[PDB]
Paper text:
To test our hypothesis, we screened crystals of Pa CasDinG grown in the presence of a 5’-overhang duplex DNA substrate. Orthorhombic crystals grew from precipitate after two weeks. We found that Pa CasDinG in the crystals had been proteolyzed corresponding to a ~12 kDa shift in molecular weight. The diffraction pattern corresponded to a unit cell of 67.04 Å x 84.01 Å x 97.619 Å and a P 21 21 21 space group, distinct from the unit cells of previously solved crystal structures. This was in the bottom quartile of solvent content for this resolution range, suggesting that CasDinG was tightly packed in this crystal morphology. Consistent with our Urea-PAGE analysis, no density for nucleic acid was observed. Additionally, no density was observed for the N-terminal domain of Pa CasDinG, despite the tight crystal packing, which we had hoped would constrain the previously observed flexibility of the domain.
CasDinG is an ATP-dependent 5′-3′ DNA helicase essential for bacterial Type IV-A1 CRISPR associated immunity. It is supposed that, once loaded onto Csf-complex-bound DNA, CasDinG uses its ATP-dependent 5′-3′ helicase activity to silence transcription of nearby genes, mediating immunity.
Residue numbers in the entry: 107 to 229, 240 to 283, 288 to 308, 325 to 392, 396 to 725
Write the structure that this text describes.
């Protein structure tokens, strides 16, 4: 037996046994278990067994689920022997100054108010300024430019937090920490070699790598920084940034899209001049604020100049906030560098596969060597589907971003709000759909409707959903983005009475989530694999969206609605999404 195997639920013991075995054998184990099965105890036992063997063990997991992970591990007597610590590196926090400035710059009152409130945690010392919270507040946050770096002045609150939090057999870190560690490891805090790696919520890991390997040149705060400097080299740098912005206008007009360097050679002169000038103004007498701003800007411009990254131009015709994104479409090299510094690994997530035991997509995303992948059978008990009603109602008009489609879909959603026992989460695939559905549902569902938009984040909507449900209303949340994948809609006021959990009683998927992924990795994956990758990403996102209904066993009165007309229209390409839905009693 394994340390803490008695704490693990019986339904996970075969998964745990195979995972421990194959991980000790040097395999990258794929372990998918339904949310609410006690996966934290399984991970605790895996890490305890590995560290008991003398292995360096690292558990990479988001800080949202890290409190309970430490709680599950601190109960194992052998874990209390070999040591447990948290490597709360700088890739975990944001820069309060830069993040504030960004929030006012882009009119995000939620993010601005959270930064002004002290960055206190939405979910030793109290952890604040977390990157994951800011991402829940700005799904499109440019983490790269706002992450707390070692070049930040020590009077920064997040910098002081990192230094204080820098307070050993089992090391626990976040996905972003592990990605940044991989990056710094490959160049010419954490173990240089990972004997045993365990990744909770592995489906997020790839998104953490792409974020770490993305560079972001934001022109407005950079120019505003240089304006408040000495006149030594100010005029050339400002002229060069102006030339870069003009060239960005020209290059975005050149073709109307994630395009490479060779498609926009006009920026090449521009960025080289920019870097040159950003290195020519004297460091003598710059506060480390401006030092960070300018060095981050030079790094971003050089990564753009690399020719190995792909660029996004966001300029005046389309985006009031000028910005140059340069990300990698090929984290192949990065994640192989990771796995080569790893003896064995267990990837744990509620959603690892797409339409089956099929872990092809996820193995491609994390670039696991095919000779090390070990696909275990997924564990989904009966209670994930037993208290669920899959209703037969749906919108006849196909989802086409039209006024007519909104007019019909909103009637169906109105009926759902009419028969709902508690809250209702209506998942959407774009802000345009949210705005149309809000236009039709506003007057009737008043003081019940929550409209998630570019000005109302997923987490402010989450807090409001919880609040209006606590007040006895049956709130109806038109949500998107993290609402598909991130939110945990289980009533924390009823930890021991799941039969009374009515926080989310009716989930309504408006559209098949085709096209929710816009990352460079997925774009290249499509350019290689085709509609296979498109459909598999859709099915994966769809299973994630379904995973918001039943978060623990013993719940009752959960209703599921799928309004997409193509689901019931007899088209062949919608074949996977029906299979998943056939796991219910309609």
């Amino acid at each position: 037996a394994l340390p803490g195997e008695g704490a693990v639920r019986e339904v996970l013991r075969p998964l745990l046994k195979q995972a421990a075995e194959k991980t000790a054998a040097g395999k990258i184990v794929f372990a998918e278990a339904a949310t609410g099965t006690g996966k934290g105890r399984m991970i605790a036992s895996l890490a305890a067994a590995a560290a008991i063997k003398g292995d360096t063990v690292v558990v990479s997991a988001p800080l949202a689920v890290t409190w309970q992970l430490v709680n599950d591990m601190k109960d194992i007597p052998e874990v209390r022997r070999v040591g447990l610590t948290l490597s709360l590196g700088r890739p975990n926090f944001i820069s309060p100054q830069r993040t504030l400035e960004w929030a006012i710059d882009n009119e995000r009152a939620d993010l601005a108010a959270w930064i002004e409130g002290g960055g206190k945690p939405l979910s030793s010392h109290e952890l604040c300024w977390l990157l994951e919270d800011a991402l829940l507040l700005a799904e499109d946050l440019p983490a790269d430019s706002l992450l707390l770096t070692s070049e930040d002045p020590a009077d920064c609150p997040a910098q002081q937090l990192y230094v204080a939090m820098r307070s050993a057999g089992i090391i626990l870190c976040s996905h972003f920490m592990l990605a940044a560690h991989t990056r710094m490891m490959q160049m010419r805090s954490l173990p240089h070699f990972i004997d045993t790696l365990i990744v909770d919520e592995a489906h997020l890991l790839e998104q953490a790598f792409a974020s770490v390997y993305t560079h972001t040149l934001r022109l407005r705060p950079l120019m505003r920084t240089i304006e408040g400097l000495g006149s030594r080299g100010r005029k050339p740098a400002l002229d060069a940034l102006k030339e870069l912005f003009t060239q960005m206008q020209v290059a975005s007009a050149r073709s109307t899209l994630n395009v490479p360097l060779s498609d926009v050679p006009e920026l090449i002169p521009a960025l080289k001049d920019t870097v040159k000038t950003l290195g020519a103004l004297p460091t003598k007498g710059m506060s480390r604020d401006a030092r960070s701003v300018i060095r981050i800007a030079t790094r971003a411009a050089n990564d753009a100049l690399s020719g190995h990254s792909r660029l996004r131009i966001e300029v005046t015709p389309v985006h009031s906030y000028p910005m140059l994104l340069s990300g990698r479409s090929n984290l192949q090299r990065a994640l192989l560098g990771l796995w080569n510094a790893t003896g064995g690994a267990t990837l744990v997530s509620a959603t690892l596969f797409t339409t089956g035991d099929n872990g092809s997509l996820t193995r491609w995303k994390l670039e696991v060597p095919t000779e090390r992948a070990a696909f275990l059978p997924p564990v989904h008990p009966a209670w994930t589907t037993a208290p669920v009603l899959l209703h037969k109602e749906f919108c006849a008009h196909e989802p086409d971003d039209s006024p007519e489609w909104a007019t019909e879909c909103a009637q169906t959603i109105q009926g759902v709000a009419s028969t709902a026992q508690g809250g209702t989460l209506v998942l959407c695939t774009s802000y345009q759909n949210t705005e149309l559905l809000a236009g039709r549902l506003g007057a009737a569902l008043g003081d019940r409707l929550i409209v998630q938009s570019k000005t109302s984040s997923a987490a402010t909507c989450l807090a409001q959903f919880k609040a209006k449900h606590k007040a006895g209303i049956r709130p109806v949340w038109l949500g998107l983005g993290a609402a598909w994948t991130g939110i945990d809609l289980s009533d924390h006021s009823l930890p021991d009475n799941p039969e009374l959990d009515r926080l989310l009683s009716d989930l309504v998927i408006t559209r098949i989530p085709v096209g929710q992924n816009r990352s460079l990795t997925h774009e290249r994956r499509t350019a290689i694999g085709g509609f296979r990758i498109i459909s598999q990403e859709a099915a994966w996102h769809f299973r994630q969206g379904l995973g918001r209904l039943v978060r623990r066993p013993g719940v009752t009165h959960k209703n599921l609605w799928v309004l997409d007309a193509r689901i019931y229209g007899g088209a062949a390409w919608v074949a996977p999404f029906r299979q998943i839905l056939d796991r219910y009693k309609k």
